[PDB]
Design an enzyme around this catalytic site. Structure first.
Site, PDB file in Angstrom:
ATOM      1  CG  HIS A 273      31.161  35.717  40.856  1.00  0.00           C
ATOM      2  ND1 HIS A 273      29.806  35.727  40.621  1.00  0.00           N
ATOM      3  CD2 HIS A 273      31.746  36.416  39.866  1.00  0.00           C
ATOM      4  CE1 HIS A 273      29.573  36.390  39.506  1.00  0.00           C
ATOM      5  NE2 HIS A 273      30.744  36.860  39.050  1.00  0.00           N
TER       6      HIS A 273
ATOM      7  CE  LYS B  50      30.569  53.236  33.967  1.00  0.00           C
ATOM      8  NZ  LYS B  50      31.319  53.911  35.080  1.00  0.00           N
TER       9      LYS B  50
ATOM     10  NE  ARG C 255      30.031  32.175  32.586  1.00  0.00           N
ATOM     11  CZ  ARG C 255      29.296  31.779  31.538  1.00  0.00           C
ATOM     12  NH1 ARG C 255      29.130  30.496  31.232  1.00  0.00           N
ATOM     13  NH2 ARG C 255      28.715  32.698  30.786  1.00  0.00           N
TER      14      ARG C 255
ATOM     15  CB  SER D 145      25.756  37.949  37.410  1.00  0.00           C
ATOM     16  OG  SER D 145      26.752  37.664  38.379  1.00  0.00           O
TER      17      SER D 145
HETATM   18 CL    CL Z   1      26.375  41.356  34.628  1.00  0.00          CL
END
Ligand code: CL
Ligand code: CL
Ligand code: CL
Ligand code: CL
Ligand code: CL
Ligand code: CL
Lengths: 163, 163, 163
Positions: free
Chosen positions: C19, C43, C92, C130
Site C-alpha cells: 500500500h 465486515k 496484484r 493484508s
Molecule cells: Cl482484507
C-alpha cells in the site's frame, strides 16, 4: 547429492484419488515424501486429524517412502523442522496457480532455503477437489469414482454417527 | 428429434436483468426452459424461495415455454427427475468458466447423460451479479438499472419489514 | 485543468509496504490523495478504524498531499462527497483485475462521472496482501519485511492485549 525429502501439505479432508495420484508420482521422484495434514484449529475440517491420517495411510501406506504427520503453525517452520528439500503442491486451476505463486514467494522471503515444486493432475482427476466431494457426499451422491473405498465408508460412518 | 428441455439452476437471489436476458435467449433455442431455484437450506439466501419464484415469474412469466420450480439436493438427481436435455449456465468471468468446467465434468461422471451448455452475457449485463446487487441495495443504492422493477420494490419491502 | 483528487479505498487491515508504494506512486501523479479506510461494520476487521488510520498516518503522513479518512456506505456516494477525479486501486493478480473491471463498470452506471485508474505493484510487493500478513502474524511469523515497523509493533500489542 543428499537424501531428498518433500512435504505435501494439505487439509486432506478427505483424501481423494487426485491426492493419491500426486503422492504416488512424487514418491517416484524423491527419496522421502511427507503427507503433512494441516490440523486446522480456527479452520474447521469435516474429518478429524485421526480420521484424515488413517484414510491417507489406508490409500498410501503401501508406498515405503511415504510418512504421515499432522502439523499446525507456519508451513515454513514445519519445512525447517522436517529438514525438507521442498514443498510439493498440485495445480488444478488458474486460481490455484496464482495463490501458489504468491505463497511460494512469501515463503521464500520468510526462509530463503524454502522451495516449492508443482505437479499438474492427470486429466482423469483434474475436476476432483475435497470440497466438491464433501458437497456430493452431504447430498447423498456416490463419491466412489473420486475417492478410495475407505473414504466412501468413512462418509457412511460420518452419516450413521449423525449427518 | 424429441422435445428439448433445459434447466437453468441458480439461487436467483434476486433475479437480475442479466438472468432475464439469458432465459429469454434460451427460450428461443429450446422447447422448454426450467428456471430451477435452488432452495439453499445450509446456504442462507436474502429472499425466500417464495419471493424468488414470484420475482422470477413476474419478469419471465410472459414467456410461454418457461417454468419455475424450487429444488434442493444433487443437481444431477434434479436433472434426471426433470428428464432434461441439458443444464444452461451463464459465464460472466474467468472464475465462472473454471468452476463451470469442473462441475460439468464432475456431473458427467455422476450421470453420463448429463450435459451443460453455456451462454455469454451481452456486454450491457456483463458486470451485473445478484451478490453485487444485494450489496448496493443494502447500502441504499439504486438498483433500478440492473434488475426488474418488481425486484426494486422487493428491496423496499425487505427494508420496510426491517433491514 | 483543475486540482486532481484521487481516492484510494481499502480496509488497510493493516497497511503493508505494498500500500505504501502505491500511495507514494499516486502522490506524484495527482494533486491530492485520500487514503479512504472502509470502516467495515458487517465486515469485521482485525484492527479498529483508529488503529488503521494511525498506522497509515505513521507510514504516509510525511507526504504533504495525502489525507486519511474513514468511510462507510456506497463508494460512489463517498466519491461524490469528496469531489474526486478518480478512484485508484492496485491490481496484484487476475482475480483482482476481473473484480475491479466489474466494479468500475457498476460504479460508472451508478455515477457517470465515476472513474477508476489502476496501478500494478513493483515485483518486490507483488506477493504481499493484508490477509496473508494477518495469517503470518497470527501464527507468530515475522512480518517485518512486508509492513512498516509501526505495524509490526501493533501486531505485538494486539498479542499482548490477548491474541
Ligand atoms: Cl482484507
Ligand atoms: Cl478443503
Ligand atoms: Cl465445506
Ligand atoms: Cl448469490
Ligand atoms: Cl451476501
Ligand atoms: Cl482473516
Amino acid at each position: 547429492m543428499s537424501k531428498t525429502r518433500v512435504i505435501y501439505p494439505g487439509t486432506f479432508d478427505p483424501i481423494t484419488n487426485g491426492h493419491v495420484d500426486l503422492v504416488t508420482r512424487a514418491s517416484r521422484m524423491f527419496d522421502e515424501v511427507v503427507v503433512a495434514i494441516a490440523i486446522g484449529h480456527h479452520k474447521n475440517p469435516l474429518f478429524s486429524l485421526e480420521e484424515r491420517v488413517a484414510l491417507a495411510q489406508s490409500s498410501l501406506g503401501h508406498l515405503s517412502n511415504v510418512e504421515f504427520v499432522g502439523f499446525d503453525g507456519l508451513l515454513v517452520n514445519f519445512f525447517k523442522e522436517q529438514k525438507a528439500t521442498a514443498v510439493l503442491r498440485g495445480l488444478r486451476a488458474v486460481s490455484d496457480f496464482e495463490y501458489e505463486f504468491q505463497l511460494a514467494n512469501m515463503n521464500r522471503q520468510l526462509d530463503p532455503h524454502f522451495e516449492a515444486v508443482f505437479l499438474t493432475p492427470s486429466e482423469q482427476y483434474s475436476f476432483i477437489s475435497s470440497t466438491l466431494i464433501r458437497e456430493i457426499a452431504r447430498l447423498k451422491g456416490d463419491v466412489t469414482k473420486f475417492v478410495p473405498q475407505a473414504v466412501v465408508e468413512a462418509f457412511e460412518r460420518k452419516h450413521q454417527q449423525g449427518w
